[PDB]
Amino acid sequence: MNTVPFTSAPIEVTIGIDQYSFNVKENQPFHGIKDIPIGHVHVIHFQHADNSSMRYGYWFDCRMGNFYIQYDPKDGLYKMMEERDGAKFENIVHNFKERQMMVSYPKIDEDDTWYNLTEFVQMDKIRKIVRKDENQFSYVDSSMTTVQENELSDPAHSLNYTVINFKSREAIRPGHEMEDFLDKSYYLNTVMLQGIFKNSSNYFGELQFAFLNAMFFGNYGSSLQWHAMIELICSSATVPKHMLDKLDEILYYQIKTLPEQYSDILLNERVWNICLYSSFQKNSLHNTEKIMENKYPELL
Amino acid sequence: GAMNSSNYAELFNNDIKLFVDDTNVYRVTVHKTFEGNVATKAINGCIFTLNPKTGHLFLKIIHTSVWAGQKRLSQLAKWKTAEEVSALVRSLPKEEQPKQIIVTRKAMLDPLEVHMLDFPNIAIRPTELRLPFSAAMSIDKLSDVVMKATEPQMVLFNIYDDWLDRISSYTAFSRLTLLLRALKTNEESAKMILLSDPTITIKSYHLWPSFTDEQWITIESQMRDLILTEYGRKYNV
Numbered sequence: 456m457n458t459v460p461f462t463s464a465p466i467e468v469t470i471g472i473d474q475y476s477f478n479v480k481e482n483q484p485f486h487g488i489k490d491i492p493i494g495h496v497h498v499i500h501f502q503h504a505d506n507s508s509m510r511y512g513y514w515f516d517c518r519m520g521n522f523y524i525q526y527d528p529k530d531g532l533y534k535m536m537e538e539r540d541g542a543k544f545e546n547i548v549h550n551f552k553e554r555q556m557m558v559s560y561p562k563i564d565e566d567d568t569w570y571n572l573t574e575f576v577q578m579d580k581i582r583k584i585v586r587k588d589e590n591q592f593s594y595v596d597s598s599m600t601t602v603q604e605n606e607l608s609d610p611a612h613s614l615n616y617t618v619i620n621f622k623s624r625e626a627i628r629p630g631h632e633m634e635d636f637l638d639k640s641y642y643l644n645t646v647m648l649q650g651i652f653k654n655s656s657n658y659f660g661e662l663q664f665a666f667l668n669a670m671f672f673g674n675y676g677s678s679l680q681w682h683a684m685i686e687l688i689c690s691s692a693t694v695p696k697h698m699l700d701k702l703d704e705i706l707y708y709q710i711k712t713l714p715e716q717y718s719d720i721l722l723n724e725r726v727w728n729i730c731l732y733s734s735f736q737k738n739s740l741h742n743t744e745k746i747m748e749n750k751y752p753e754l755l
Numbered sequence: 756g757a758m759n760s761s762n763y764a765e766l767f768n769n770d771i772k773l774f775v776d777d778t779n780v781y782r783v784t785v786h787k788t789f790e791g792n793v794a795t796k797a798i799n800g801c802i803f804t805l806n807p808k809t810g811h812l813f814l815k816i817i818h819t820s821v822w823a824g825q826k827r828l829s830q831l832a833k834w835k836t837a838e839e840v841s842a843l844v845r846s847l848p849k850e851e852q853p854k855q856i857i858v859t860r861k862a863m864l865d866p867l868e869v870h871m872l873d874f875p876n877i878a879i880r881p882t883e884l885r886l887p888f889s890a891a892m893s894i895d896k897l898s899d900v901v902m903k904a905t906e907p908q909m910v911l912f913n914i915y916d917d918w919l920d921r922i923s924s925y926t927a928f929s930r931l932t933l934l935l936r937a938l939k940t941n942e943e944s945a946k947m948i949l950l951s952d953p954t955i956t957i958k959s960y961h962l963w964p965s966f967t968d969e970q971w972i973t974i975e976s977q978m979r980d981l982i983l984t985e986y987g988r989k990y991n992v
């Protein structure tokens with residue numbers, strides 16, 4: 456079990472750790488989060504009480520270093536940093552744990568929600584999408600744009616998701632125009648899976664990361680990416696059966712976790728109705744279709 | 756974006772453009788089978804591709820053999836149309852290629868856009884105009900070449916005959932659309948109007964009769980009457 460220690464909490468803030476959130480009051484004696492499960496990536500995210508606009512946060516893996524948060528009063532945000540002095544870090548964390556100044560990651564024993572949301576997400580792939588090579592953790596906020604959003608403005612602060620564009624020469628083989636546009640299997644299996652992602656685990660990892668960025672930060676570019684990756688699979692007549700089964704599980708847990716009051720913005724009516732009711736895979740996503748129909752039948 | 760009444764003079768500027776109409780590509784007769792079911796039999800069709808400034812009509816004849824063994828023919832027709840337009844553009848010198856292609860039905864946008872990915876500088880546009888190009892198969896000489904074709908074939912026409920010698924493109928297109936609207940609303944009356952005078956012939960190398968300026972005004976007025984008439988016989992006004 457790992458720990459993220461905080462130098463202090465000088466400004467009132469709502470703190471999020473994966474799907475959990477809590478409030479810290481201005482100058483409250485708060486020194487971080489303990490009992491964080493090893494073996495998964497994590498995200499620690501923030502929403503200032505005084506300017507609810509721009510959520511921001513950090514993806515990290517406690518196996519890759521000792522990380523802590525300290526507020527920066529010049530830049531006005533909680534920053535993640537890496538302490539290279541291990542003995543110093545363990546001593547600090549022990550002092551705060553003895554004074555009981557830390558909250559406890561309250562994972563219920565029965566509960567596989569976070570695993571199920573992050574099964575294919577790996578820090579090394581996150582760091583290729585979020586380019587900031589000097590740190591082992593990755594900063595994301597609400598306003599960051601994607602490489603494709605910049606094609607349609609700072610490239611260093613972009614999200615480098617894989618560009619998916621259904622009306623593009625990458626997607627359409629000369630002389631197979633109708634075929635490839637109406638059945639995207641070539642683009643899914645040959646271009647994207649074999650060519651770019653190499654395997655379906657890397658594809659699912661980017662899909663899950665995009666959803667989580669979209670839901671935690673309200674990142675428009677991430678939502679566009681998540682939906683495009685779903686739609687590419689649903690619009691392919693030929694998909695390996697293990698990918699369809701896993702996709703159904705992935706989407707099931709994303710829909711289950713989505714806060715009901717943000718479905719309006721996080722779910723694209725056209726993509727989902729197409730995917731569940733018109734596409735090649737309309738009959739292949741039994742779990743996802745059942746939860747969507749029972750939870751969000753308005754959208755449909 | 757979409758082409759409408761507010762940008763109508765754009766058609767006659769010096770940027771090369773083509774209208775594409777696919778409404779006569781896939782044509783069928785519906786009939787009863789010996790067992791009392793219903794079947795379709797295709798007949799020859801055509802793509803209607805028109806430069807509104809010059810009158811140049813690229814008429815691609817769609818022979819029924821192109822549907823043999825194919826499924827979902829109405830969807831295939833839009834892609835076949837897009838493939839043939841793309842081939843036509845590629846066959847033209849660069850200086851003759853269009854800067855814009857305006858499709859008369861929105862379902863042609865994605866097929867044509869996909870077939871023209873090689874041409875990112877060519878704008879593919881819909882229109883809010885309800886243009887009567889479906890009635891092209893009421894022009895006797897065009898119907899004749901389509902129904903006689905025994906193989907795929909491209910035929911080139913000037914749909915304005917020699918009118919541009921005397922009138923502007925804007926006026927020629929207005930006349931053409933008035934004639935085609937009339938032929939669409941009541942083909943027999945429209946054709947009677949156009950031929951009622953045996954002394955006004957259609958030249959071998961033309962589609963329409965050799966009307967004088969004065970007679971064209973008469974004709975145009977009678978065609979407007981017909982369109983208004985039929986609009987009363989239709990809505991009881």
Ligand SMILES: OCCNCc1cccc(Br)c1
Binds near residue numbers: 461523544547
């Ligand atoms: O006075 C040493 C401050 N170094 C920064 C820091 C390192 C580890 C944990 C925390 Br909390 C803060």
Ligand SMILES: OCCNCc1cccc(Br)c1
Binds near residue numbers: 472476477559560
């Ligand atoms: O508003 C929900 C309150 N969440 C409970 C909670 C409290 C303290 C720490 C963590 Br982590 C979670």
Ligand SMILES: OCCNCc1cccc(Br)c1
Binds near residue numbers: 670673
């Ligand atoms: O009406 C578009 C306003 N942009 C906010 C937004 C839209 C959809 C998803 C996410 Br996440 C964020």
